[PDB]
Amino acid sequence: RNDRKVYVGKVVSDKMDKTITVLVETYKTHKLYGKRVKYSKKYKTHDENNSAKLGDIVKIQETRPLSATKRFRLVEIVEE
Amino acid sequence: TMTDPIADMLTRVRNANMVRHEKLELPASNIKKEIAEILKSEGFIKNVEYVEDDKQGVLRLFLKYGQNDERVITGLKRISKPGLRVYAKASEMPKVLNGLGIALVSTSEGVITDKEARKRNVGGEIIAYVW
Amino acid sequence: PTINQLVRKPRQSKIKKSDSPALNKGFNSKKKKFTDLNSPQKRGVCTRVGTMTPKKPNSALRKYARVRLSNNIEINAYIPGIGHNLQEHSVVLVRGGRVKDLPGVRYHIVRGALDTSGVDGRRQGRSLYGTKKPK
Amino acid sequence: ARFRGSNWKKSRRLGISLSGTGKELEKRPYAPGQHGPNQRKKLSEYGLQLREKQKLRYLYGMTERQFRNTFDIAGKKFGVHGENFMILLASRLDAVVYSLGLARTRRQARQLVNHGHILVDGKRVDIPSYSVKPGQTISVREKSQKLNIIVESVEINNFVPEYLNFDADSLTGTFVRLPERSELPAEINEQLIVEYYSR
Amino acid sequence: FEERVVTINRVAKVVKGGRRFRFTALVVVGDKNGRVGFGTGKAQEVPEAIKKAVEAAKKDLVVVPRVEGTTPHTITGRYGSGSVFMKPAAPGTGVIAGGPVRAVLELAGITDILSKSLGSNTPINMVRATIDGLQNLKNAEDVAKLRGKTVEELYN
RNA sequence: CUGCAUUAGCUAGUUGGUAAGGUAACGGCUUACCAAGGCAACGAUGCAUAGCCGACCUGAGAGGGUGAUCGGCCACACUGGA
RNA sequence: GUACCUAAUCAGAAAGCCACGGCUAACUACGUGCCAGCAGCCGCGGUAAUACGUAGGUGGCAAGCGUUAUCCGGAAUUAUUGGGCGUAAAGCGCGCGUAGGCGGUUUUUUAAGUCUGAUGUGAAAGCCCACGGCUCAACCGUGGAGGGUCAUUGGAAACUGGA
RNA sequence: GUAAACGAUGAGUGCUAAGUGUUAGGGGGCCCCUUAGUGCUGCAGCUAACGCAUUAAGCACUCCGCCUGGGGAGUA
């Protein structure tokens, strides 16, 4: 029933075995001056088969803790 | 280089109004044409013509002066800018000069005035103030 | 500045200094250190008592005391009113408020508190000088 | 009352007969004090605002704190701030009793209500600050129905405002509706008081 | 026409021996029905300075559009470094203004308004800024005529 | 959701994997082996300060300041470990 | 045996604090004489001081009134709202350039920003509005209203962003 | 690696009366028009004033650098 958060982002490093780090980009607004400013957050997600490669735009979903800092799992590779 | 054609058009109008010129030729664009048509409909300018020439096209505005040569356009102010963009909700639409002026707005229902935005209950990017 | 400049380096307000620094500091004897506590008055002991000549254009012999406060800070405190019964080792209460004429005197001694006696013969604005109602 | 000073000196200061008779201003319409006579100085705007505020306050025999609180609540009421403040001042039990005429003086009415000779809707009210509202009735205590002071005051057929309906036979008044500015004294410029409390 | 003396100032011109002192009077004149003006007068004595200032003010008057005792819309009058922001209020608000601005507004007859002097507080430039704002005020009927429409069309 | 760059490098169980143990529970939580990863000018690391919040004071507002009483959450019980 | 109610006696027990040169409401006399002293700032005091001390009078408050300390305001004096940089403080001595910021005209498309609904939630108490109860008020209770940069979900496509 | 390194005036872009000199060009009949500089005078507008004014200090938009009373001190 209840679904879990899903994010789409580019892969910025895959040197780890079966792990890819996904860079999700957002635009937070300055609380006083109101301007839109870029915000990048790197997500450590599980890559079981090493299918994802550095550069491709992938989709990840939140899971239970899988490692010290891995909390997400790769769902599909939207683009490459 | 050029960074805000809407601001350039408003400043052309302001300078021509100051010098009490009659007409005004500026490079054309769809947003500029809609702004000019709104100005004509509201009564701040006398007329608008479009010249579909080569390149970009041209907008030819004809300004309106009241009796005693009084200027109908008191002032134009760019509100949303490339360096900082301003949007407003329907319930937060501003009243220019307590209602005596118009705020040109860009909405999902076309670029309209603040009166129309409030009536249709929509918001959008507040392009400019004209009073 | 541009909005981008303000986002990159936001505006910074001027910092305000207190006019009575010695009242804003306590002393913890066990840890032998100072602490930041705001007090309206502090007790002290008159290390010295005497008179000072005001800066020009004024001329007078203004009565003052060098006082070591409970927080171990040594300050100069003006003695208000006509006549005082203070000498070295007198225990006095000190409040804020500088005397413009006296350069280094930034505090006042409360009258009618601890050792300091009320002004004798004062009848108008007595509370400011610690004098009981004569009746 | 709480203020027990020379009401004549206060009237002379403020240039108004707080009692309404005019006795204070008849002979010496100038200010009290050594410099009272031969006074010719001109008041600043702040002085004028202060004088207007003090006129209203001493007219209604209130203290500064309660006066300010009443001004605040009047400002919180819908309408014109000054007019609302004046009508609320009128709606006080002291003012209502004085207007009904159960006493000749505002201070006398205050002392009567303070000592409890009055009843609102048939119940005792000792607090002159009590705020009456339309549809209420002001009566007199049975043990005090035949007091010399009250009967003497009722004898003098004083004018009864339109917002009050009084029957002297029963010593019973009714607060019909809220007053209006015309009914309220015109010697007060409420705008000056509003500006005073603005600054 | 009611008249109020805003400020009286003792100015001095230096001469070979001593100084020459003169009195300058700044005065505001208004009928309290939408007409207000200001003037300055110089004389050796304040009564004559005031009289000259009153004459100048009566010579120079401006018409202040109003709406039930308040201005048609908010305006910021500017002159030199003077700057006065003025905003319509509701009945019973009072005139929330300080210094010469209050004199100008009261003599123009405005009884309910909010204002703030944002610039120089020198009385003459304060008055000039206030007068500039009042001159630049606009009224619904006149703006409708200028734009070739009706009041109802103007408000939609 | 805080100040400092007159703090620019930090990290080696550290980052990931395989296996095992362990716990109510996932997980470097721990331990062996394989690789060299991981964080950081979008401010890491370091230093200084601080219980957090509902709220409270102030201001026309935007904001600025505060975190008594009362309620929620966290932490602690002479200091440290079990 | 507290509140409260009933009956009797007496104006009799129950007023002080600061200020009065401008700001800032309130001025005269005497004493002192750049001394004694005052002072928030400008300053006041050297012999006729509304500024010192006392007196009378006056002003503001009142069971409080003043002083001190601290915060916000006034301060547009860090300026988003809402300031500036020729001479008042402020354009790097000047290039080449990375990141970032921003970006010319038209069409199609997307719906991240933007706009508009629904649903959940944003405890209670508190601020605000209304009502009700203590003789009134503070206070107490009830019902509203508001508070998100919140989350899911359906719609719009001018503008910014992607194709 | 600093100068009163100055126009004590950051860069880019567009718009807003005119008169007149000069440098390098271009087009049309000694004259007219025009592009890019370099000077002087001068409206509107701006400025506290002085002044600026199509080579803005005017009207606007983008980015950068810089200021927040004097001294201590461009010092420790």
Add this chain to the structure above:
RNA sequence: GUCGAAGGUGGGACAAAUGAUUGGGGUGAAGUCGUAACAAGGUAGCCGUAUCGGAAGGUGCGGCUGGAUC
């Protein structure tokens, strides 16, 4: 037997207080020496740099007008 608080030893880091003596800074008077700047300030001044001199300053080189009578 593993882990393990406290403790011990060692070389570093950081912070605060204090220290013979010493450097310039401010303040205070009616002190001493000169007179550098403001007028053509009596050698126009000022900016950077070098050097010299009790001191202000002088001189050299370049720069500015925020100087220049006739």
